Design a protein around this ligand. Structure first.
Ligand code: GTP
Ligand code: GTP
Ligand code: GTP
Ligand code: GTP
Ligand code: MG
Ligand code: MG
Ligand code: MG
Ligand code: MG
Lengths: 435, 429, 131, 435, 429
């Protein structure tokens, strides 16, 4: 009766969707064929039910290159999905926001919108959309920008959360990532009700340090991101001692409308061989969360301020221990709150412990924690992009590709001033008040 | 979906194409007869990119063979891997262009261009969603150079938004296989910079050096050189015909690798390359390949890259590997090599990863490099052009076919403009 | 033709209940005291009249509406006007007709945004249009 | 005791007859040899009964070229039909209304009328005639026009339904379809108690989109039309929660005598592979019906008005959900009713679910819906024909074939003015009145 | 049911008729002896259209052979598939018309026209309900031209409302097989335009070109040309002798393709056509056939259709196919080719589909085109006529048989009126 649909844009979106829906199928005891041989109808959120025992997800997988969609279709999770929401294009945007937003994205936007409206019209208590896309690829950035525009025009007040793959500072896979990132950020700034940044370099570092996997693959990063999303949706999907909804996320984490960019962190992340040797107390895992190494963005929060934080616990969690841990965190030296916010902590508790996927890398634990922080150091990252942008905008590099596909140079300019204005706003929020 | 029409012109183009289709047949598991004898559905799930499925479960290449002398076509037909081609595509002349670019672009090419374009039009109508064209030819002989320039011009005027690949053999710096190759190369490069989205310069001297030093082959036949060229071509295209943890295609590589429309001349490279006996003495891991590429001795272009700057670098991988190791090596090779990369392109490396290794080898890769060093090449040719145009050497041959000195002057001026353009972007800060 | 806008998250541009109620009261010269009374739809129809000359036909709309089917018919007229002017914001008549605060206020705040988007500066008497 | 006979004219008529009578034989459990190894005598409507258990249909298959009739005779359904109602001509009309209405049609019309009278005289409560014919072929158009004249003259007031193959806008098989179409429409406008337009292009699009049959044949279109006809006759042939008769169709769908041209739509149309993954709620199928893509004519209703609609549901259909779905349809934006009709919905309910043909393309469902809508956008289609006609009438093309076969040029003219008058009537109905 | 009498005139007529009856015998599975050796009742359910049931389960063709020299008749009798024809129908002369139209229409033809018409009347009385007649002859020789014109005149005066087909070989533009073919062709076309409901112009040069280029036959014998003509005949008629998802007959094609009574001269085409080796390398799909037809190289008429406009186009199909694909291909080929089709005939394409393929081939088709390009043909002949009538070349030969110069003048004037008529409807808007 509480519905919330997912929209996966780009190849990264599709792979994270594979991971997330595998995790969901394990969580609710659903076979890949859709049958079912601390729990409410918990699955009614993500899984719509047919006449028989078959359950199908409420998600849309869209990508202009049919490769990953064919892999999903021919994969193990074949019978599960309804064949319509596996939408393919013909040619990829090829890391071109122009191609993914003006030239090709228009050719299939109507079909995607029609499938979304069919999905929504049969729901009862739809809360919102979980958008999984990257800023690197042209498909992800451009098509997501267009889709958020159209959804905002069509649906008035539904929370629209973005779990984007923010481009890394030094470990970059493309060459034109800054252009696409600036364009998509400037476009989605006025539709993204809350956007959660996550970076590849930090997750690589976490995997090498904690999971002890010297050579991790994207499967592992998708597993961690899926765990984050499951922790976020646990309150909706399960009984909890202290429930929290999506509107609560959108309200407690966004002090100003333009500054809506929290970052995520998960704990504990320890291997089965290291599953023992420590009891994983709530204070211990919270200390691990607030440690700058376990964060999933290449930014040091100790050089900024914390406007807000939201901690979600799941499992056998004792609330007084939660209070003691929070107080101890507040007392420490590396956590100074901003002047205008004397209370920046939200707490949610769920009884359902995290679900361990067979063949995975993590270990089955009894308590788990997701940390969502809206802090100030993230603004520093923006500066880097701006600098990069300006460098590649000094010589008009790669501009012709966008120009010849329905883009204006003034759009690049206005994106640049909008990013500079966002940085100025972040800096102004950073300072303290008089008196 | 995303079908590619492959054209080969000249004897060089014909031979590299024969080897290329051999390599593709091995990759997709196809008999000489054209039947499927593979063992994994992955080989057939994207067979349509290069192969048209005729009746009775048979697959034919989507290739066009063009020449002006029947010897090459007869050689292709007679040998193995010859029955799979469609005979109507066997378009050939009778006299040969005689190593003259004018006859290959104006006189003789005009007698077969119409038929070639009708075949191209039929194939384009038959395919589902055309991706682009790739041409294999050379700039030394008259036939390949002139006919390829004419075909590229006509096709791009028939299809503006499609992309066109040209894999042109550039004459060696030390020795010259022909005598009047300056004029032919100048006019061909003029046409290419006019109407091509990218080009891969390939040099015979560099291939000989690679075969002798790295491969330890004391008797390198042309078959081996064509095999390396075909392996490079297949490594470039592999991101489209098979799944991967990070999929790419020709369009992504073109967009990432071309910051300015004129600058679309690249160098290819392949890895790993080991001698017959020296194969088991080395572990095939990601850093080994990465350190094997970024060096002069593994570049198929006759120009030391360290004389200039790296503008962009595309790297395609094949085989099950961890992406983090790939990314770490890319970051390290960029960081320790800050001097040779352009500063005003931060993160000037494109990375693509497939999942299917190339026929035996546990994993391999492919290197495309957009660097300014190739400008030296152009200058050398330009100088030779002047050395042969100040005194009007062999000029009357091309004058007797109706083309006048003004095309020579315009082509020389445009090439010099390209050289200065490379120099300016090399000196940018 | 008419331009269209949206409303996702903006500060210092969200007006209070009483302020918008005074705005509608002053722009149509009447005495609504509850914003959910805008479920009638007559105010929206006269607003469309004032935004574009003609573009509607007020004879069909029933300013004395007091039942649900009357609300539905008025919203059908409003939807026809929206289609005629090319504004493509689908309106949730099903939630509006029940007359509850949430969707009524949402629709009126979006409509205030759209009204500010497409108003010129003309003056007239709302009564003559109303009768 | 409630009888209604069928008349199939032209090759299209005969093929849709094959499909419809296959569907009927399956519905009532009739072997092709006429034996019987939510049900009342349900079969007494279409099937007359002999002394033994053999049942024979009350239908007339008439066609001037003996090819299709020979195929029916030598086909599987050989023993079923009474050999008299398989009436053949000798030469085909060859897309010539004149040949099918004045020269050749007269030579066998008396036999057809005699057989129809023989069928009628042994009935008890005959409601009417279901005429299946095309406007393209000369046989269909001309012979149907003549037969409608003779039946109207002979039988005073019995409902006469026409399920015609309206010529498509761009996908045509003939060249002289405009002349035949205007002539037959002008002729039958005074006899067709209700004519239901259906177009080939739209059914092709439906089959490609929904059935996922990349290469459908006429068999599938005939199956769909047979399903429509069976849904129409379900109320007569079966028990229902809310029954509806043919006179009800003729009354609720015809506001003005000259405007009697509804269009048909069927739902759901989904394959067995896609039979799962959605529950096919009544609201869902009704939304699919009112979607402009699922309509079977290339005319988009969103640029016109809905004068009337008649929806027939069959299967396990709960009436409150019907009411809720209809209300939601009425609330939407793409359905604007005409001023003079404040109530344009008729609803019928039948308990018998639709019957699946073995070897068919659809999937066995539990609920089914037929939408029969008299709207205004259909008038647009007429305009197209008119334009074509005038073009073909600009240079007097193909006129000699009609002139030298017993036709006057004044007939073509008067058909043209009558058709223009029909368009003007449609337009004046479309507009709104004062006060 | 719907029986057709086939008449053959001239050596060309007899040869094409013999090969045509061979093709029909293969289609219906009949021995040269005339017995039935097929395996499907579909072959026999409509055997009566061309074959008459003699006693003892024997089938004889409903064909009449006419000539003035015994050589052709002896050749037909002696060879295989010759015992099937019923002997009295072998009506022949002794001297031959000597390539003179007057002797074939006035002097010699008058001595056998009565016997031919007695046979025709007997056959018409014996048939159930006659459909129409089809004539296979040529306009070059005197015998075929004159005798066919006379027969068509007398028959159409004996049967007004029946339909009559003529498959007339029109002289080639480049070379002329005879010398005085202008007069013969002019008079024959005059008679045809008076008393024929349609005609299929066929040209030897076009057939040679198709055989050499498309069929890749370096040594095309006349048998192959007659094979293509007979295949065209069978493809045209197949809609009547077998069931189909959309049945047609001769009358439907005549009504659809003839907008004006004079304009009834068409061009035939066949598909698919492939070389011996190039057959398996191609998938035979509906769009492949559609793109094979709409081009000059597959038209049996010696005139490029793109010089003029398409008035109407009839397309007959054979083989199990999806009708929507047929319809989509027709719509696409009309939409992308809006320029060459007449505007004031919207949707100017007739489509017919049968169910029986024509042997070895799983599906095939047949093309009939009513276009104005053929007018060029007429003008050429007209010019030659003037070039040979201004100086009275060979005129005394036809003057010595009783024909008058006035008759030549009326024939030329009527042909020029026809040319202007085509020109006017080509310029209509
Ligand atoms: N963490 C993580 N990032 C991924 C994964 N897959 C793709 N990415 C990111 O996606 C970027 C590549 O561009 P994409 O967004 O995937 O491009 P696309 O969606 O294929 O669309 P095109 O650019 O048109 O091909 C890389 O920079 C990665 O950071 C994944 O599995 N895990
Ligand atoms: N890599 C490689 N290059 C080759 C090979 N064979 C020939 N070439 C190059 O191709 C050039 C041959 O000239 P072509 O372009 O083929 O000239 P052509 O097509 O024969 O036309 P004509 O010169 O008129 O006879 C030489 O300059 C060689 O450098 C080969 O086997 N491998
Ligand atoms: N949807 C559909 N349409 C058909 C079918 N069969 C024939 N038609 C239509 O019929 C038209 C052909 O003309 P017909 O009415 O069949 O002509 P006829 O009944 O054979 O009579 P003649 O014209 O004298 O041959 C085509 O345009 C088709 O649209 C069918 O099975 N399904
Ligand atoms: N397509 C085709 N045409 C042929 C063939 N044989 C002859 N012709 C044509 O037929 C013409 C022969 O003249 P005919 O009409 O047969 O003259 P005839 O019947 O022999 O009478 P006379 O000329 O008096 O001897 C030539 O112009 C050829 O173009 C053939 O085998 N195939
Ligand atoms: Mg992509
Ligand atoms: Mg050569
Ligand atoms: Mg018929
Ligand atoms: Mg002779």
């Amino acid at each position: 009766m509480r519905e919330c649909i997912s929209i996966h844009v780009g190849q990264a979106g599709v792979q994270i969707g594979n991971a997330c829906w595998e995790l969901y199928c394990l969580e609710h005891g659903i076979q890949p064929d859709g049958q079912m041989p601390h729990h409410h109808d918990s699955f009614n959120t993500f899984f719509s039910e047919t006449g028989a025992g078959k359950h199908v997800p409420r998600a849309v997988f869209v990508d202009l290159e049919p490769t990953v969609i064919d892999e999903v279709r021919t994969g193990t999770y074949r019978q599960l999905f309804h064949p319509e929401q596996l939408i393919t294009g013909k040619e990829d945007a090829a890391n071109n926001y122009a191609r993914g937003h003006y030239t090709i994205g228009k050719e299939i936007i109507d079909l995607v919108l029609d499938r979304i409206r069919k999905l929504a019209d049969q729901c009862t208590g739809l809360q919102g959309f979980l958008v999984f896309h990257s800023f690197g690829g042209g498909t992800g950035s451009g098509f997501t920008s267009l889709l958020m525009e159209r959804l905002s025009v069509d649906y008035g007040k539904k929370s629209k959360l973005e779990f984007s793959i923010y481009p890394a500072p030094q470990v970059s896979t493309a060459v034109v990532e800054p252009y696409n990132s600036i364009l998509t950020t400037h476009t989605t700034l006025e539709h993204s009700d809350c956007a959660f940044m996550v970076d590849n370099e930090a997750i690589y570092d976490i995997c090498r340090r904690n999971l002890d996997i010297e050579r991790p693959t994207y499967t592992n990063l998708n597993r961690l991101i899926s765990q984050i999303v499951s922790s976020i949706t646990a309150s909706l999907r399960f009984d909890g001692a202290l429930n929290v909804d999506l509107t609560a996320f959108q309200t407690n984490l966004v002090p100003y409308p333009r500054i809506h960019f929290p970052l995520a962190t998960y704990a504990p992340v320890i291997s089965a061989e290291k599953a023992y040797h420590e009891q994983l107390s709530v204070a211990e895992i919270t200390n691990a969360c607030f440690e700058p190494a376990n964060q999933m963005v290449k930014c040091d929060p100790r050089h900024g301020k914390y406007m807000a934080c939201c901690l979600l616990y799941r499992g056998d969690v004792v609330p007084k221990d939660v209070n003691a841990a929070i107080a101890t965190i507040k007392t420490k030296r590396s956590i100074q709150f901003v002047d205008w916010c004397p209370t920046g902590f939200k707490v949610g508790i769920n009884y359902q412990p995290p679900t361990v996927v067979p063949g995975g890398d993590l270990a089955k634990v009894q308590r788990a924690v997701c940390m969502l922080s809206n802090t100030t150091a993230i603004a520093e990252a923006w500066a880097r992009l701006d600098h990069k942008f300006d460098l590649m905008y000094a010589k008009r590099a790669f501009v012709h590709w966008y120009v010849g596909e329905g883009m204006e140079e003034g759009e690049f300019s206005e994106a640049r001033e909008d990013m500079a204005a966002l940085e100025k706003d972040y800096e102004e929020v950073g300072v303290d008040s008089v008196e | 979906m995303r079908e590619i029409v492959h054209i080969q012109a000249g004897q060089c183009g014909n031979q590299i194409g024969a080897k290329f289709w051999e390599v593709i047949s091995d990759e997709h598991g196809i008999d000489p007869s054209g039947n499927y004898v593979g063992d994994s559905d992955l080989q057939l799930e994207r067979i349509s990119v290069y192969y048209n499925e005729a009746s009775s479960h048979k697959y034919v290449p989507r290739a066009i063979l063009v020449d002006l002398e029947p010897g090459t076509m007869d050689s292709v037909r007679s040998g193995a891997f010859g029955h799979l081609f469609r005979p109507d595509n066997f378009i050939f002349g009778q006299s040969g262009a005689g190593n003259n670019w004018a006859k290959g672009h104006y006189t003789e090419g005009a007698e077969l261009v119409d038929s070639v374009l009708d075949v191209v039009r039929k194939e384009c109508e038959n395919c589902d969603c055309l991706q682009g064209f790739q041409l294999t030819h050379s700039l030394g002989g008259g036939t390949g150079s002139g006919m390829g320039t004419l075909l590229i011009s006509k096709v791009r005027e028939e299809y503006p938004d499609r992309i066109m690949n040209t894999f042109s053999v550039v004459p060696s710096p030390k020795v010259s296989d022909t005598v009047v190759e300056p004029y032919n190369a100048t006019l061909s490069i003029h046409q290419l910079v006019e109407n091509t989205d990218e080009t891969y310069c390939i040099d015979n001297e560099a291939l000989y050096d690679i075969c002798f030093r790295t491969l330890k082959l004391a008797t390198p036949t042309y078959g081996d050189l064509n095999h390396l060229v075909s392996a490079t071509m297949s490594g470039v295209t592999t991101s489209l015909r098979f799944p991967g943890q990070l999929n790419a295609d020709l369009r992504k590589l073109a967009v990432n690798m071309v910051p300015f429309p004129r600058l679309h001349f690249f160098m290819p490279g392949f890895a790993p390359l080991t001698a017959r006996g020296s194969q088991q003495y080395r572990a095939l891991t990601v850093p080994e390949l990465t350190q094997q590429m970024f060096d002069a001795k593994n570049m198929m272009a006759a120009c030391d890259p360290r004389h200039g700057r790296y503008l962009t670098v595309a790297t395609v991988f094949r085989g099950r590997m961890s992406m983090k190791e790939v990314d770490e090596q890319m970051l390290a090779i960029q960081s320790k090599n800050s001097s040779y990369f352009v500063e005003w392109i931060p993160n000037n490396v494109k990375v693509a990863v497939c999942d299917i290794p190339p026929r035996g080898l546990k994993m391999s890769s492919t290197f495309i490099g957009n660097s300014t060093a190739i400008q030296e090449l152009f200058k050398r040719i330009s100088e030779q052009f002047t050395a042969m145009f100040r005194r009007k050497a062999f000029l009357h041959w091309y004058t007797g076919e109706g083309m006048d000195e003004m095309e020579f002057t315009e082509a020389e001026s445009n090439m010099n403009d390209l050289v200065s353009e490379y120099q300016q972007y090399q000196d940018a800060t | 033709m008419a331009v269209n806008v949206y409303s996702t998250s903006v500060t210092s541009e969200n007006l209070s209940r009483h302020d918008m109620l005074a705005w509608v009261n002053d722009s149509l010269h009447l005495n609504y005291t509850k914003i959910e009374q805008l479920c009638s739809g007559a105010a929206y129809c006269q607003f469309m009249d004032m935004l574009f000359p003609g573009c509607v036909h007020l004879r069909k709309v029933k300013f004395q509406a007091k039942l649900e089917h009357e609300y539905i018919h008025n919203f059908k007229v409003l939807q026809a006007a929206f289609k005629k002017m090319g504004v493509d914001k689908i309106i949730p008549v099903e939630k509006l007709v029940k007359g509850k605060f949430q969707d009524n206020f949402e629709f009126i705040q979006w409509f205030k945004k759209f009204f500010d988007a497409n108003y010129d500066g003309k003056d007239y008497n709302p009564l003559l249009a109303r009768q």
